[model samples]
Target: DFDLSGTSTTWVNELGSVMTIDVDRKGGVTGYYVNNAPGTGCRGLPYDLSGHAHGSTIAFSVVWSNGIADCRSATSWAGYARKTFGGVQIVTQWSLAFVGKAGGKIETGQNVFTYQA
Candidate 1:
C-alpha cells in the first residue's frame, strides 16, 4: 500500500514539481530523493522503483502552477496510485522532476524521504 501526505498547489510562473516514493521487499526503503525542475516534456507517469521483486507501489504528490504573477505560492495536495508489489513491503525510493516550458530538469531542494525496514 502507498500513503502520501502533503500539499498539491503548483508553483506560479515556474515549472511543476513531483515527489515519488518507491517501496521494496522486507518493507525496506531502497531509494529516497527529490527533483526540483523537471523538463516540460516529461510525462507525469508512475515510475518503476522495484529492483528485484514482484513489483512495487508508487504514491506521489503533484503541485500545479499557482499562476504567472505569483511566483511564491503553496502547492495543492493530491494522491495517486501506481503498480503494486506483493505482500512484502518493497523498498521505498523518492524522487522528483519538473515539467513545463523549461523541458526536463532536476530541481534543487531538501525534498527527500527514506526509511529502513
Candidate 2:
C-alpha cells in the first residue's frame, strides 16, 4: 500500500544515492536535471508491487531552469520501488516523467508516491 501527505515537516533518512536523468545535449543547449531518492533494502519478487523484499519508498522533486526564448527545452525523471515478500525482491511501482517547454517558458514535473517492502 502507498500514501502521500502534504505536510511540510515530513522527512525520511536517505538510505541510498540520489539518481538523476539528464536530457541529451544538442548544439549549444545544456541538459536539464531530474533527481530521485531510493529507499533502504527490504525483502519479494523484483517486479511485484505489493510483495515482500521490495525497495524503500521515495519522495522526490524535479526543477527546471535555463529559460530562453524561441528554443525547445526538455527534462525527464524515473525510478522504481521495491519490497520483499516470501524471501523475494519485488518491484511494486516504476515511474517516469517527460517534460518539454518552448523558449521563455518553464515546466515542472509531478510529485509521486512509491511503495517498497
Candidate 3:
C-alpha cells in the first residue's frame, strides 16, 4: 500500500498540461493545474484544485474559474499513483463538463503523470 500523506508531487500530461498536488496526512488534496493545449480558453492559467487520496489510489478535481468569461468548466480526475522501475508515476482518467452553460456535454480522457527529473 502506497502511503498518500504529507507528500507533494507534480505531474504532466501528454498535452503538456501541468498539475501539482499536495496531499495532507488525511488524504486531502490541494493543488493547481495549467493547461497548455491550444484552442482552450483557460490555457496557461493556473486553476485551483481539490481532491483526496487513499493508499496507491488518488483523485482530484478542478474548476476553471478565474473570473474570466472565456472558460467556465469543471473537471474531475480519478486514478492511481504507483512506483515504477525508474520513478513515481500517476495515471488518471478525467471527465470535464461545462458549467454556466450546461447541456450534458462532457469530455473524458486519460492522463499520465511522472515526476520531472
Candidate 4:
C-alpha cells in the first residue's frame, strides 16, 4: 500500500501555506492547515482538515471558519503526491467558496506543495 504518512508529514504551498498531515494505513487523512497567504480571512491560524487517501492520490479540505470577523469561506482540494528528484511534491487544484461574501462568490486555484522539514 502507498503510505503518505511515511512519505512526508509536512508540505508547504506556493503562498507559504503549510499543511501537516497524518495518513493512517486505512487511507484516512487528518491534518491541520495554516493560512499564510496575504488577504486570507484567517491568516496564520490553524484550521481543521480532513480527507482521504488513495494510493499516491489524496483529497483533502479545510474550512475557514475561525470567526475572525473577516471572510468566511470553505476550500476543498483534490490532488496527489509524487516523488521527484529534489523531494516529494503535492500538487492540488482547489475550489474556494466565499460563503459570507456577496452572492456567495467562488474562486478556483491550484496549489503546489513542496516538502517542508
Candidate 5:
C-alpha cells in the first residue's frame, strides 16, 4: 500500500530556498509549498503530484504553474519527477516573460528542489 501518510518535510532548492510538502497516508498530496509574491517566480507550488511504488523506488510525476500576472512563468517542470538521497530535486523548469508593461523579455532555467528533513 501507499504508505506516505503523516508526512511533513521541507524541500530546499539549489538557490537555498526551503519549501514544504505534505502527503496523506494513501500517497495523496495534502499540502504543497507555494510562494506568491511580487516579482518572484512560483517556487515549489501550484503543483499536482502522483505516486506508484516501483521496484525499489516510488515512481512519481508532477507539474507546476509558474505563470503570473506581472510576469509569465512557463511551467518548465512538466511530467518531471524523481528522488535521491544525495541531491535536491527538479521541481519545474520553464520560461519567464513579462506581460504587457514595457518589460517583455523571455528567459528559461531549471529549478531544482531538496528535502529539509
Candidate 6:
C-alpha cells in the first residue's frame, strides 16, 4: 500500500559493514554495497542476495544455485526482514551467518537497523 520506488535505504552494522539497496515499487534490490567489516574475509558476499516484497513485508535471501560447489569451503548466507507499522518502509533488522572457510570458524550474529526515510 506504499510506494518505495525512490527510497534508497542504508543498512549499517557496528562491525564496519554497511549496505544500501535501491528499492523499486515492487521491492526489488537494484544495488549493493561492499562488506567492509573487520576480517570480512569475503567481499563477494553480497553477490547472492535476492529480494522480493510480498505486499507489506519484504525479505532478502541469499541462495546458491550451484549446489554451493565453489562455496563448499564455506557456508554463508544473509537474511533480512522488513516490516511496516505506519510509516516509511524499511528493513528493521538483518543477520549474516558464516561457517567453514569464510572466516575460518563458525560465526553467527544479528544486528538491528533503524528505518531509513
TM values, all candidates: 0.20, 0.20, 0.84, 0.84, 0.44, 0.48
Which of candidates 1 and 3 reaches a greater TM-score?
A: 3
lDDT of 5 by residue, 4-108 (tens): 457666655656545454665555443343545345655435544344331223333333443432224322233244556544354556454445566566656
Q: What's the number of clashes in each of the models?
A: 32, 28, 0, 0, 8, 0
Give per-residue CA lDDT, model 3, range 1-117, as digits (tens). 436467667778888999888888888889888888656778887898999877888888888886653476788989887788756788889998884455668999888877763
Clashing pairs in 6: none
Off by over 4 Å in 6: 1-3, 43-48, 54-56, 62-107, 115-117
Candidate 1 C-alpha lDDT tens digits along 1-22:
3432231111111233333344
Please provide, for model 6 over 1-117, each residue's C-alpha lDDT reduced to its tens digit, 9 standing for 90 to 100.
Answer: 324577777666555555566777666765454455566444434534456554556556543223323333232333444554743434334444444535545445554443444
TM-score: the better of candidates 2 and 5: 5
Q: Which regions of candidate 1 deviate over 4 angstroms?
A: 3-35, 38-70, 84-117
Q: Candidate 4's residue-wise lDDT over 1-117, tens digit each?
A: 235555447888999999898887778888888988877768887888999887778888888765553456789999887777856787899999875436788899899988866
Model 4 residue runs over 4 Å out of place are 5-8, 67-70
In model 3, the clashing pairs are none
Clashes of 6: 0
Cα displacement (angstroms), candidate 1, residue 9, comes to 20
Q: What is candidate 6's TM-score against the reference?
A: 0.48
- Give all candidates' CA lDDT scores: 0.30, 0.26, 0.80, 0.80, 0.46, 0.49
**CA lDDT for candidate 2:** 0.26
Candidate 1 has an lDDT of: 0.30
